[PDB]
């Protein structure tokens, strides 16, 4: 089936942060408003038998002293920090854009519980695809919070997938921001190929995913397994689609992944307050919906995850269509969405036009395309992989 992560306590935890507020709730209420929930298998967040089992699960990637620090920060916010406690938090970047707040640990752990359960649903073949709009926190590092990401649920999910059995995972990152934390976690791993398309420019967060000059792309046995495509501001649906479509198709052909994990951050939308990219949610074509439909036609068990997205109703408008599209492509069952927002709890946030379409008026890539094709051949040479060379060459 097509699965989706939610639950009554999960919704409360996803809506408890001061930066993302009730975003998760507009998303899931618009999905519900459009009668998509009965088509979907509810996947319940994972829970643990003990503190030890939780720590063992989280420290599959994060360090215990980081997890300890993050737990102490929540406790400290449920009661000012001492100077020693501020040094301690500062050594984990638990400050500035990743501050504490009374449920910071329960909030962060929630996305991990969600995305681990989603991986398990794919592994036991209960679901062909599972959606977790509560997840996607791709900037968190082993011992460092970053970009309002405290725990890296994607790393943890991918780790669970590669240890389910040669298993290969293809990770595709559509967020406006470079997926540095996931890329770093698998830098030396050939079995997890990572691919991020993003904006990169001087001073723009997080700063990686671009020239260094040359692209770094892996190390040790993981050489050539980290892929990156940085694009200039202003790019629209068609050019971003043409930019990534042949790369996606060539990655599937050569890598033949056992799973695809997609980060689908909505901050590339033309109407995001960031205002870097000009993508839409249009479905006559949205860059996002083009990519997901492409990935889904491979018929590989797939995890779709959230991410950034700071225009809350327009993130809901996008992820609702992603949700409807996944159902159409997986079950083969037409999904008819009215162009007008249905009446529901958050109906007033979709003003003043109350439509589903967002309210927007719609050489370098060929160098990167040749750059990536050589890297892909190097990867395949390094890992003794089979494929037809000019079958992938012709995709461009």
Q: Which residues bind ligand GKW (CB under 6 A)?
A: 97, 139, 147, 175, 177, 205, 265, 267, 273-274, 307-308, 310
Residue 309 CB, shortest distance to Zn ion, in Å, is: 8
Q: Which residue is nearest to ligand GKW (CB)?
A: 308
150, 98 in Cβ contact below 8 A?
Answer: yes
The one of K ion, ligand GKW, Zn ion, none whose footprint includes residue 196, by CB under 5 to 8 A per kind, is K ion
The one of K ion, ligand GKW, Zn ion, none whose footprint includes residue 147, by CB under 5 to 8 A per kind, is ligand GKW
The one of K ion, Zn ion, ligand GKW, none whose footprint includes residue 97, by CB under 5 to 8 A per kind, is ligand GKW
169, 161 in Cβ contact below 8 A?
Answer: yes
Residue 29 CB, shortest distance to ligand GKW, in Å, is: 21
The DSSP secondary-structure symbol of 13 reads H
Judged by DSSP in three states, 169 sits in strand
The one of Zn ion, K ion, ligand GKW, none whose footprint includes residue 198, by CB under 5 to 8 A per kind, is K ion
Nearest to 48 by CA among 32, 59, 39: 59
| Cα radius of gyration rounded to whole Å, the chain | 20
Residues 6+ apart with CB under 8 A from 330: 1, 2, 128, 129, 296
Give me the residues that bind K ion (CB under 5 A), please.
173, 175, 179, 186, 189, 196, 198, 222, 225
Judged by DSSP in three states, 343 sits in coil
Residues 6+ apart with CB under 8 A from 297: 329
- Confirm or deny that 77 is annotated as ligand binding: no
Nearer to Zn ion, 151 or 380 (CB): 151
Residue 204 CB, shortest distance to ligand GKW, in Å, is: 10
Nearer to ligand GKW, 205 or 396 (CB): 205
Residue 144 CB, shortest distance to Zn ion, in Å, is: 17
Catalytic residue among 138, 139, 198, 199: 139
139 noted as active-site residue = yes
147, 97 in Cβ contact below 8 A?
Answer: yes
- Confirm or deny that 8 is annotated as ligand binding: no
**DSSP secondary structure string for all residues of 108-121:** HHHHHHHHHHHHHH
Nearest to 299 by CA among 254, 244, 246, 258: 258
Catalytic residues: 139
Residues forming the site for Zn ion (CB under 5 A)? 175-177, 265, 267, 308
| Known binding residues for Zn(2+) | 175, 177, 267
């Amino acid at each position: 089936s097509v699965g989706i992560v939610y639950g009554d306590q999960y919704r409360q935890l996803c809506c408890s942060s001061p930066k993302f507020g009730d975003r998760y709730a507009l998303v899931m209420d618009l999905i519900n408003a459009y009668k998509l929930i009965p088509e979907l298998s509810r996947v319940p967040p994972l829970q643990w038998d003990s503190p030890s089992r939780m720590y063992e699960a989280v420290t599959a990637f994060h360090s215990t002293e980081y997890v300890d620090a993050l737990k102490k920060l929540q406790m400290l916010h449920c009661e000012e920090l001492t100077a020693d406690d501020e040094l301690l938090m500062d050594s984990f970047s638990l400050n500035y854009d990743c501050p504490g707040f009374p449920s910071v640990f329960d909030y962060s752990l929630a996305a991990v519980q969600g995305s681990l359960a989603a991986a398990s649903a794919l592994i036991c073949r209960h679901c062909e695809v599972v959606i977790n709009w509560g997840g996607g926190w791709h900037h968190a590092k082993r011992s460092e919070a970053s970009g309002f990401c405290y725990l890296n649920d994607i790393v943890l999910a991918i780790h669970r997938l590669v240890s389910s059995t040669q298993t290969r995972v293809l990770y595709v990152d559509l967020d406006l921001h470079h997926g540095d934390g996931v890329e770093e976690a698998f830098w030396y791993s050939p079995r997890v190929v990572t691919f991020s398309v993003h904006h990169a420019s001087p001073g723009f967060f997080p700063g990686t995913g671009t020239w260094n000059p040359i692209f770094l792309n892996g190390a040790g046995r993981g050489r050539f397994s980290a892929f990156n495509l940085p694009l200039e501001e202003g790019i629209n649906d068609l050019d971003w689609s043409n930019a990534i479509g042949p790369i996606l198709d060539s990655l599937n052909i050569v890598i033949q992944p056992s799973y695809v994990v997609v980060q689908c951050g909505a901050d590339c939308l033309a109407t995001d307050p960031m205002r870097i990219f000009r993508l839409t949610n249009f479905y006559p074509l949205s860059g996002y919906l083009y990519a997901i439909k492409k990935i889904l036609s491979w018929k590989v068990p797939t995890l779709i995850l959230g991410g950034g997205g700071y225009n809350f109703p327009d993130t809901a408008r996008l992820w609702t269509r992603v949700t409807a599209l996944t159902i159409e492509e997986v079950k083969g069952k037409k999904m008819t969405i009215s162009p007008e927002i249905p009446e529901h709890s958050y109906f007033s946030r979709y003003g003043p036009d109350f439509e589903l379409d967002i309210d927007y008026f719609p050489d370098s890539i060929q160098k990167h395309h040749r750059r990536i094709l050589e890297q892909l051949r190097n990867y395949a040479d390094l890992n003794k992989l089979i494929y037809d060379y000019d079958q992938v060459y012709q995709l461009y």
